[PDB]
Design a protein around this ligand. Structure first.
Ligand code: MG
Ligand code: MG
Ligand code: MG
Ligand code: MG
Ligand code: MG
Ligand code: MG
Ligand code: MG
Ligand code: MG
Ligand code: MG
Ligand code: MG
Ligand code: MG
Ligand code: MG
Ligand code: MG
Ligand code: MG
Ligand code: MG
Ligand code: MG
Ligand code: MG
Ligand code: MG
Ligand code: MG
Ligand code: MG
Ligand code: MG
Ligand code: MG
Ligand code: MG
Ligand code: MG
Ligand code: MG
Ligand code: MG
Ligand code: MG
Ligand code: MG
Ligand code: MG
Ligand code: MG
Ligand code: MG
Ligand code: MG
Ligand code: MG
Ligand code: MG
Ligand code: MG
Ligand code: MG
Ligand code: MG
Ligand code: MG
Ligand code: MG
Ligand code: MG
Ligand code: MG
Ligand code: MG
Ligand code: MG
Ligand code: MG
Ligand code: MG
Ligand code: MG
Ligand code: MG
Ligand code: MG
Ligand code: MG
Ligand code: MG
Ligand code: MG
Ligand code: MG
Ligand code: MG
Lengths: 271, 46, 93
RNA sequence: AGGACCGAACCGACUAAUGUUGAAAAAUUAGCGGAUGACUUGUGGCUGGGGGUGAAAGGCCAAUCAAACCGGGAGAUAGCU
RNA sequence: GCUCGCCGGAAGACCAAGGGUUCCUGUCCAACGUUAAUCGGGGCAGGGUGAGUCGACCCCUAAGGCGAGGCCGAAAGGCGUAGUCGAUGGGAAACAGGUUAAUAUUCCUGUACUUGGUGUUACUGCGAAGGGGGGACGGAGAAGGCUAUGUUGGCCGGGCGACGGUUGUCCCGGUUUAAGCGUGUAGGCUGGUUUUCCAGGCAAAUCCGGAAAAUCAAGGCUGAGGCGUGAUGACGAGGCACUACGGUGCUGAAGCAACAAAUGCCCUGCUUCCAGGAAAAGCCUCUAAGCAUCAGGUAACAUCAAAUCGUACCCCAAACCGACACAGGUGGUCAGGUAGAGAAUACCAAGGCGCUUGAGAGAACUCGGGUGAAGGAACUAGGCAAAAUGGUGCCGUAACUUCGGGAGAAGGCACGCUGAUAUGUAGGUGAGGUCCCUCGCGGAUGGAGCUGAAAUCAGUCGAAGAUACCAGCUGGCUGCAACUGUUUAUUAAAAACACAGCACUGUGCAAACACGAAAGUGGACGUAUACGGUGUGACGCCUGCCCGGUGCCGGAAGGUUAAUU
């Protein structure tokens, strides 16, 4: 649910929180945990290669099964837990043979529901099947690109993918960005939409909230000197230039995709 | 007033020590230059 | 056992001072100058074999050399090792 | 509960006076701001000079920064003193 | 030596860093010390640092570094796998008393604890480069139980006061004891067991995980403190006797109770919130290959071992960083009394100091303060500076508003001491005793003793009772920025930067983009509710017209057009 805070202080006046009482108030499953130290936008040369990244809350990585390659063994949803590493919620599922795995929680999932992966799995949310065993017009998430590689599309909270047509060894998908794309019919997909759809309704309310998530402040290029941004300089507010990136590439409308290798699988652009 | 030189023996050894000079060829040339000059103390190590 | 060579090399000199006299008079302890790399086991074995006495325990410490000046010339003395070896109450060396 | 309030430590630096061959190559005194947070601090580590880093002042990068320091080209050149 | 003054959350004591003999003794005053110097962190000589338990070393890892092969690169080299290093973190064990001129949890006494190796005996399935558990973890909040510690009473020793009184409701001092062992409490966590089966833990496993049965319903884990012991001991006010006049030897009374109480412990606990909170080893458990009446494991005992380096001294400073014996800077620990909410502040304790030139005089003028007739901003660029306000409880408080605020708005009353209510109250703590039960650190009752606010009434002193220190000036109109924050280290703190929010645009993942001759890395172990760039800057109402110019996006009929041929 979404809750508006009360303006007891200027920092709380605009905070809008998302609270789900159905999330596990305890600790995560220990054997599926790893450490992931923060980069700070620095590569192995030590240089900042992505700006505005730094600090934030300490996080532990939850290993999530994007492959869903346990065919024929049913599983039951144990609990839903918060995941710091992503905008969606993750689910603890318990396989019949006593195996525990983390999966992306779809919409409508709850503790006690069953899931199944395989060619013969029933068509219902949470079940993973190859897309040649999934009807046309259905809604899927965690879609694979290459058979066995793992889910890579429709992974964020509230995102999904529609199967629009089937022909030959490929199936067409309408991605959430809007483009029509082709993918092998052998690639596996999970039925239903990703949960936590209200995640985009939140409001950070204050600068500290953004600082808690690892973001650092962004300085406008027009606010500095010409020696370190093409937008710099001027006595007072002066622009007189075509907007560009900090490295001189025009940044309002110019396309930058250049990949002839994968151009053959784009049916239409996102428009 | 906090000045610029804040002593720390471990950091001094790690930055300007003999084994730090021998870890690269430029440090080796530093040692060779100091040996050619005749310095009584090649490094800060001792 | 430790060879006769080390046992004849490790001991150097008997230390003399007011503290050494007090130790020898009260705690049955003699203070000796020993080799810089002489372990407590070597000290004990050498004191037993070369003095025909009976040793309880050995305490060691390294004395640092004092920086001096020989008329504007800087000069440091050598470090050495001090041994506090305790007899078993019936030796009276 | 709160980038909530008053207020020591702690972090700073708005005003005035003194000091200006200073006690001090940036301080002292009386007031002043924050003071559970975008806080502060110890230890160790990483980013190197047309490069770094910068909540952006051309700021900082060892009392030096519209291009650090050291050595070399080098006795640069100087229609000037 | 006697007085006086200063600090006392430090100007006292102890760790770390850093320094290295500055520590103690004898000797000396040439130079050094901003003066003198018999003094000294100065010169010379000698002495001083004792560890199985403290720290390092050692075992284990973080960020990161190096990196066999490997990939890439004119050369030099770059990145990185297996590995190997890397603490600021995880891992065994000692306390109290005494002793030096200078060391002590290290020496001596007393009493302990840990790990490892061996040998004897007894019982016996041991075994890893592998599996599982554990180690192992956030912010804030609250309560309960304690302890350090303090106060008072009791007890013991001493005293009867240079000036009126002081055999008493008087004065002064002491009233201390650890680790370890036993007990296992206030308290928190969790159902226990025994079979049977199993797509899981790379193979296996009796271990973990899953499933199904019966059975008992209290077992297990943790846990401050208290109590007995340790301890018929040590220490102890003093006293006696010497003296080389610093001190030294012997002997030694009481050594209880009540109340108060931490920011410390139980507590890695409990509750709650989102921003969702290291790793690995030591440790426990399982087994594989292997060995199988030998090894190996367990248990008791005995013996042996625990090596090497550091330990002096300063450490908010005259010894470290500042060229100085420099109003500077420097991480952590300890935390008494009265008043006080307080680690503020005032005065004190323990403890440490009077800051390495003084002596006179009492001009102008400068600096730091006190007071001031009448006036009260007339000063000045400007109320700059100064003056003023200032606490607690209670009464009371406008426009406006995003309904939270504004607000401590404004303004006002009371406040000391004494007695009574009440030989000290409401309340807190709580013994003896009565009874009961899972028998003990137990439960109900009981109220002695201790402690103890706030209020009302009456009286009373001074000019003044928040009497000192300490401690908001208030109100009205208006520009700018929503706000908390950040910035020109060292003349600019702001209206500048950032900001939550908004919009445009790019990006389908081997993503865009960025660092890189490249390999690779970040983005991100993220996947369009995501990421990057740009502009604007909460919120409310809104954001109108122009595509001619420049840019960008799309198109490709025609014109022109490179290498090539
Ligand atoms: Mg960005
Ligand atoms: Mg932004
Ligand atoms: Mg500017
Ligand atoms: Mg430019
Ligand atoms: Mg202008
Ligand atoms: Mg213009
Ligand atoms: Mg030097
Ligand atoms: Mg030692
Ligand atoms: Mg605040
Ligand atoms: Mg600053
Ligand atoms: Mg000040
Ligand atoms: Mg404020
Ligand atoms: Mg404040
Ligand atoms: Mg400028
Ligand atoms: Mg500088
Ligand atoms: Mg230049
Ligand atoms: Mg030339
Ligand atoms: Mg010249
Ligand atoms: Mg000396
Ligand atoms: Mg003289
Ligand atoms: Mg003199
Ligand atoms: Mg001295
Ligand atoms: Mg001296
Ligand atoms: Mg010993
Ligand atoms: Mg590594
Ligand atoms: Mg490398
Ligand atoms: Mg190689
Ligand atoms: Mg290692
Ligand atoms: Mg360490
Ligand atoms: Mg001492
Ligand atoms: Mg007590
Ligand atoms: Mg606190
Ligand atoms: Mg010491
Ligand atoms: Mg002085
Ligand atoms: Mg000083
Ligand atoms: Mg500080
Ligand atoms: Mg004070
Ligand atoms: Mg005068
Ligand atoms: Mg005056
Ligand atoms: Mg005055
Ligand atoms: Mg007047
Ligand atoms: Mg008057
Ligand atoms: Mg008036
Ligand atoms: Mg006027
Ligand atoms: Mg005038
Ligand atoms: Mg003023
Ligand atoms: Mg004043
Ligand atoms: Mg009264
Ligand atoms: Mg105007
Ligand atoms: Mg502002
Ligand atoms: Mg400035
Ligand atoms: Mg300023
Ligand atoms: Mg990549």
């Amino acid at each position: 649910a979404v809750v508006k805070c009360k303006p007891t202080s200027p920092g709380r006046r605009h905070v809008v929180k998302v609270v789900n009482p159905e999330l596990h108030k305890g600790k995560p499953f220990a054997p599926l945990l790893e450490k992931n130290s923060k980069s700070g936008g620095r590569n192995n040369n030590g240089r900042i290669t992505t700006r505005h990244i730094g600090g934030g809350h300490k996080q532990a990585y939850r290993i999530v099964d994007f492959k869903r390659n346990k065919d024929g063994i049913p599983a039951v949803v144990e609990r839903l837990e918060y995941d710091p590493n992503r905008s969606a919620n993750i689910a603890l599922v318990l396989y019949k043979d006593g195996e525990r795995r983390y999966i992306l929680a779809p919409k409508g999932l709850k503790a006690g529901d069953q899931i199944q992966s395989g060619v013969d799995a029933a068509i219902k949310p949470g079940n993973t099947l190859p897309m040649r065993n999934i009807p046309v017009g259905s809604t899927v998430h965690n879609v694979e690109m290459k058979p066995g590689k793992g889910g890579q599309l429709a992974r964020s909270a509230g995102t999904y993918v529609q199967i629009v047509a089937r022909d030959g060894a490929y199936v067409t998908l309408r991605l959430r960005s809007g483009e029509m794309r082709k993918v092998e019919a052998d690639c596996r997909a999970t039925l239903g939409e990703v949960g936590n759809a209200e995640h985009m309704l939140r409001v950070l309310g204050k600068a500290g909230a953004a600082r808690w998530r690892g973001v650092r402040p962004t300085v406008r290029g027009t606010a500095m000197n010409p020696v370190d941004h093409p937008h710099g300089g001027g006595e007072g507010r002066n622009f007189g230039k075509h907007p560009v990136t900090p490295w001189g590439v025009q940044t309002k409308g110019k396309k930058t995709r250049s990949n002839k290798r994968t151009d053959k699988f784009i049916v239409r652009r996102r428009s | 007033m906090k000045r610029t030189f804040q002593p720390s023996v471990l950091k001094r050894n790690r930055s300007h020590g003999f084994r730090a000079r021998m870890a690269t060829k430029n440090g080796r040339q530093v040692l060779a230059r100091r040996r050619a000059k005749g310095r009584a103390r090649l490094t800060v190590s001792k | 056992m430790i060879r006769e060579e080390r046992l004849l090399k490790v001991l150097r000199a008997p230390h003399v001072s007011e503290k050494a006299s007090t130790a020898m008079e009260k705690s049955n302890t003699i203070v000796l100058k020993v080799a810089k790399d002489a372990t407590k086991a070597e000290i004990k074995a050498a004191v037993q074999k070369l003095f025909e006495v009976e040793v309880e325990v050995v305490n060691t410490l390294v004395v640092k050399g004092k920086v001096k000046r020989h008329g504007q010339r800087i000069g440091r003395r050598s470090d050495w090792k001090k041994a506090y070896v305790t007899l078993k109450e019936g030796q009276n060396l």
